[PDB]
Amino acid sequence: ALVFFAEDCGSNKCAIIGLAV
Amino acid sequence: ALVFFAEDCGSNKCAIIGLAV
Amino acid sequence: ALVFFAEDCGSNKCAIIGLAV
Amino acid sequence: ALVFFAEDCGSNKCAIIGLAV
Amino acid sequence: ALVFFAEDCGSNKCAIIGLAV
Amino acid sequence: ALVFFAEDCGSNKCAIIGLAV
Amino acid sequence: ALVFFAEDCGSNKCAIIGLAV
Amino acid sequence: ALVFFAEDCGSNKCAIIGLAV
Amino acid sequence: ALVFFAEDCGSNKCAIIGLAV
Amino acid sequence: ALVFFAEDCGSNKCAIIGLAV
Amino acid sequence: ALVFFAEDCGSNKCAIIGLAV
Amino acid sequence: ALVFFAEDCGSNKCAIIGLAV
Numbered sequence: 001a002l003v004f005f006a007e008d009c010g011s012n013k014c015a016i017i018g019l020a021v
Numbered sequence: 022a023l024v025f026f027a028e029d030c031g032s033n034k035c036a037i038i039g040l041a042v
Numbered sequence: 043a044l045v046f047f048a049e050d051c052g053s054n055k056c057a058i059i060g061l062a063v
Numbered sequence: 064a065l066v067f068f069a070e071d072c073g074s075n076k077c078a079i080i081g082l083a084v
Numbered sequence: 085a086l087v088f089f090a091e092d093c094g095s096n097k098c099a100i101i102g103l104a105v
Numbered sequence: 106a107l108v109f110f111a112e113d114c115g116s117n118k119c120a121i122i123g124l125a126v
Numbered sequence: 127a128l129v130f131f132a133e134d135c136g137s138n139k140c141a142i143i144g145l146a147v
Numbered sequence: 148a149l150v151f152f153a154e155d156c157g158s159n160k161c162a163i164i165g166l167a168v
Numbered sequence: 169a170l171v172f173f174a175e176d177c178g179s180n181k182c183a184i185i186g187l188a189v
Numbered sequence: 190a191l192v193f194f195a196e197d198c199g200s201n202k203c204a205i206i207g208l209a210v
Numbered sequence: 211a212l213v214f215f216a217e218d219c220g221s222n223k224c225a226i227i228g229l230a231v
Numbered sequence: 232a233l234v235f236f237a238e239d240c241g242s243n244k245c246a247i248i249g250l251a252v
Contacts, residue, residue, distance in 0.1 A: 001176055001185070002149060002168070003238040003245070007213035007228075008064055010031020014213075017064070018238075019084065021149070021187065022113055022122075023128055023147065024049040024056075028066040029211060030083075035066065038211070039049075040231070042124065042128065043092060043101070044170060044189070045070040045077070050127055052115030059127075060070075061147065063103065063170070065212055065231065071169060073094025080169070082189065084212065085134060085143070086191055086210065087154035087161075091171040091186075102154075105145070105191065106218060106227070107233060107252070108196040108203070112129040112144075119129075123196075126229065126233070133192040135209075136157020140192065148239055148248070150175040150182070155190055164190070165175075166210065168250065178241010197232060199220025206232070208252065217234040217249075 004019040023042045028035040046061040067082040088103040109124040128147045133140040151166040170189045175182040193208040214229040233252045238245040 001240055003240065005215065005236065007215075009211055009213065010029070011034060011036070012032050022051055024051060026047065026049075026068065030064055030066055043072055045072060047068070053118050055116050071094075073092075074097055076095065085156055087156065089152065089154075089173065091173075093169060093171060106198055108198060110131065110194070112131075114127055114129060131194065134157070135190055135192055137159050139158060141158070148177055150177065152173065176241065178239065179244055181242055197220075199218075200223055202221065215236065217236075219232060219234060 002021045004021070006017055006019060007014050008017045025040040025042070027038055027040055029038050030036075044063045046063070047058055048061060049056045050059045065084045067084070069080055069082060070077040071080045072078075086105045088105070089100055090103060091098050092101045107126045109126070110121055111124060112119045113122045130145040130147070132143055132145055134143050135141075149168045151168070153164055153166060154161050155164045172187040172189065173184055174187060176185045191210045193210070195206055195208060196203040197206045198204075212231045214231070215226055216229060217224050218227045235250040235252065236247055237250060239248045
């Protein structure tokens, strides 16, 4: 599968997360 | 315009946000 | 099917609508 | 992550589900 | 139009459906 | 960026708008 | 609602169609 | 990559096509 | 939920997979 | 296939492009 | 919110940009 | 156009690819 990337900015911290499809 | 609803969920808290289009 | 929701904000007047898939 | 909401509707009944991203 | 295919799995019945665009 | 277009048809009145990405 | 524009192109001819949302 | 499938119904003929991502 | 289908190719080893939504 | 239209805008100028699916 | 990344390649300049959702 | 990025995994042989739009 494909794994995208995104900066998941919550209320306390951001972080690069994958997104698996 | 259309406004979708979503929750921006960080560590362990969420917040309603709109998404305007 | 899945039904999404959105506020359809027209000429100064909104209303929730469904979106079928 | 972002959480969307939709109705998952079957033959007769529906249910709210999250769609997390 | 394009017709996608999906398994609409409900509470007591899955079934292939078209999704038209 | 890419700019898409859509007719925003409100309370009996449409108008072309852009959508930036 | 929003109305996107698209062309439904077959063999070698196209036709404008709307896509309502 | 992922290869989806769709019935591409033009004006003269439909046909299962891939969609490569 | 809806289950779409795709061929998941990597090094010429495709295979049908689901995509749950 | 379906053909969408968008403006591909750079530093200063834009251009119409098709997005075919 | 989620921040995707893309290379916005224009006529005479590519550059990484965020896309916020 | 915009170029997104993803890891294309098949049999544990991932690698960065573009996705042109």
